C-alpha cells in the first residue's frame, strides 16, 4: 500500500518562502533503491523536475533553480521537504513528489518514476481578495434564429480560485459547460454557458448565479435579449 | 539545458499500434539518458510507465513497451485500448539533472471525429461602462481533443489579447474549451468585423459579429 501526499500552503506572496512536505507510506527512505523526486506541473504547461533525494542522501536539483531549491529527508518521521525561496510568479504550478527506484541489473541500472501523489497546488498572487465580476453573455445577431439558444456568464477579476455557478431556466436549462479560470494577471476568469431551445427564452426567466465562498459574496444575473 | 523534444498529438484505434518518440536536442538518445516513461490522466493523475529505456514498472499492462529507435527514445503500444488516450510524457538524463519532454496527447477513437460547436459573444454593456470589453468565444462537442483558435479584426490578424485554455472532457467524453478576446472599449467602437477562427482536423470553422448587426 504505497501512498504519497503532498502538503503546502496555497497561496503566496511573490519573495516568501515555500515549504512543501511529502509524506508517504509503503516504504522507507532507510532501504537502498528508495528515493524521492519532485516535479511540478506549471498551469497550462509541461512537467518541470525539480530535485532528487535518495537513502544514502544523495541529492540532485534542476540547474536553474539550483540556488533557490534545497531538499531534505526525515526517515524517521517518513517524510521529504523541499524549500524554494524568493518564489515569484513562474512558480504557481501545482506540485507533486514521486517514489524513485533505483535497480542495478546485470550492469545495467534502471530509474523510475512510479508512485506519484495527486499534488497541492501554489498560486503566488500578490493580489488580496477580490469578488467577482459578472457579466450577462446575450446572444449578438447574425444568428438569433435557430432551433435553440446558447446563452452565458463571463465571470471576472476574481482571488483566490473556487467559485461555482448554477443556471436556472423555466424549461430545459440543459446543455451547461463550465469552463476553466484562467488567471490573468492575479485574478482569474471563467465561463459558463447554458443551451435551451429558442421557444425557451426570452419567455422563460434565465439566470445565473455565482458564488465565491472565500468572500461568500453571490451574484444572481438574468439573461436579457441584446438588441439595437 | 537540452531541448526534449516529442510530437505533439497523434491518434489511432482500438487495435492499433502506435509509436511516440523522444529525442534530444544535443545529439543520439543513447542508454546513458535513462529514458523515462509516464501517462498523465485528466485531474493529475500520472502513472509511471517505463524505466531504463526499456524497462516496465510491474503493475502496468504489457502492451507498453520501450526501446531505442535511431537517435531517439520509443513508447510502443500495442492494440491501444480507449482507456489509453491520455497525454504522455517523457524525460531524459543529463549526468546531475533530469529534463522532461513537451507531452503527447494522444488519442484513441473511442468514438467517431466530431466538429466543434462555435459560439462567439459580444462585450456586455455593463461591461463596455468600464472601459474593457472581453470577446468569449466558446468550443464544444469536439473530438478528437485538439483544436487551434484564430481571431481577427476587420479582417486582419489579432497577435494580441487572446488566452485559450486547455480542451476538457464532457460528459460525452468528448472535449470543449474556451478563448478570451480582451480590448479596450476603445478599440471595440473602431473596427466592425469580429472573428472566432476555429481549427479541427485541417477544416476551419468560424464565427463572427459584425457592429452593424441588429438593425
Ligand atoms: N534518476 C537518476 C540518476 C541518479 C543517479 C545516477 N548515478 C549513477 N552514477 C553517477 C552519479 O551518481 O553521478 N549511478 C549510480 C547511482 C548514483 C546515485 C544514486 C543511485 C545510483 C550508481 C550507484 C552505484 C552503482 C551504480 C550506479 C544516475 C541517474
Known amino acids: 500500500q504505497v501512498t504519497l501526499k503532498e502538503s503546502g500552503p496555497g497561496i503566496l506572496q511573490p519573495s516568501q518562502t515555500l515549504s512543501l512536505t511529502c509524506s508517504f507510506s509503503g516504504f522507507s527512505l532507510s532501504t537502498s533503491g528508495m528515493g524521492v523526486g519532485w516535479i511540478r506541473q506549471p498551469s497550462g504547461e509541461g512537467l518541470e523536475w525539480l530535485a532528487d533525494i535518495w537513502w544514502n542522501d544523495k541529492k540532485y536539483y534542476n540547474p536553474s533553480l539550483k540556488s533557490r531549491l534545497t531538499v531534505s529527508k526525515d526517515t524517521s518521521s517518513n517524510q521529504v521537504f523541499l524549500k524554494i525561496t524568493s518564489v515569484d510568479t513562474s512558480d504557481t504550478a501545482t506540485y507533486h513528489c514521486?517514489?524513485?527506484?533505483?535497480?542495478?541489473?546485470?550492469?545495467?541500472?534502471?530509474?523510475?518514476?512510479?508512485?506519484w501523489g495527486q499534488g497541492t497546488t501554489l498560486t503566488v498572487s500578490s493580489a488580496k481578495t477580490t469578488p467577482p465580476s459578472v457579466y450577462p453573455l446575450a446572444p449578438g445577431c447574425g444568428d438569433t434564429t435557430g432551433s435553440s439558444v446558447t446563452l452565458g456568464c463571463l465571470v471576472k477579476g476574481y482571488f483566490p480560485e473556487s467559485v461555482t455557478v448554477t443556471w436556472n431556466s423555466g424549461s430545459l436549462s440543459s446543455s451547461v459547460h463550465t469552463f476553466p479560470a484562467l488567471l490573468q494577471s492575479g485574478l482569474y476568469t471563467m465561463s459558463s454557458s447554458v443551451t435551451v431551445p429558442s421557444s425557451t427564452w426570452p419567455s422563460q426567466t434565465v439566470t445565473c448565479s455565482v458564488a465565491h465562498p472565500a468572500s461568500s459574496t453571490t451574484v444572481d444575473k438574468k439573461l436579457e435579449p441584446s438588441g439595437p | 539545458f537540452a531541448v526534449v523534444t516529442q510530437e505533439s498529438a497523434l491518434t489511432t484505434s482500438p487495435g492499433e499500434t502506435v509509436t511516440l518518440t523522444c529525442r534530444s536536442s544535443?545529439?543520439?538518445?543513447?542508454?546513458?539518458?535513462?529514458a523515462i516513461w509516464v501517462q498523465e490522466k485528466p485531474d493529475h493523475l500520472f502513472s509511471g510507465l517505463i524505466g531504463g529505456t526499456n524497462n516496465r514498472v510491474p503493475g502496468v499492462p504489457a502492451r507498453f513497451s520501450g526501446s531505442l529507435i535511431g537517435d531517439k527514445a520509443a513508447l510502443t503500444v500495442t492494440g491501444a485500448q480507449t482507456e489509453d488516450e491520455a497525454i504522455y510524457f517523457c524525460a531524459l538524463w543529463y549526468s546531475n539533472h533530469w529534463v522532461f519532454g513537451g507531452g503527447t496527447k494522444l488519442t484513441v477513437l473511442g468514438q467517431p471525429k466530431s466538429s466543434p460547436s462555435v459560439t462567439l459573444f459580444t462585450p456586455s454593456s455593463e461591461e463596455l461602462e468600464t472601459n474593457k470589453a472581453t470577446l468569449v468565444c466558446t468550443i464544444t462537442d469536439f473530438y478528437p481533443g485538439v483544436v487551434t483558435v484564430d481571431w481577427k479584426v476587420d479582417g486582419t490578424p489579432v497577435t494580441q489579447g487572446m488566452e485559450t485554455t486547455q480542451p476538457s472532457k464532457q460528459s460525452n467524453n468528448k472535449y470543449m474549451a474556451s478563448s478570451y478576446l480582451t480590448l479596450t472599449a476603445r478599440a471595440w467602437e473602431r473596427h466592425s468585423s469580429y472573428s472566432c477562427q476555429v481549427t479541427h482536423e485541417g477544416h476551419t470553422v468560424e464565427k463572427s459579429l459584425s457592429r452593424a448587426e441588429c438593425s
Open positions: 514521486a517514489r524513485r527506484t533505483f535497480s542495478y541489473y546485470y550492469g545495467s541500472s534502471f530509474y523510475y518514476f512510479d508512485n
Open positions: 544535443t545529439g543520439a538518445v543513447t542508454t546513458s539518458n535513462y
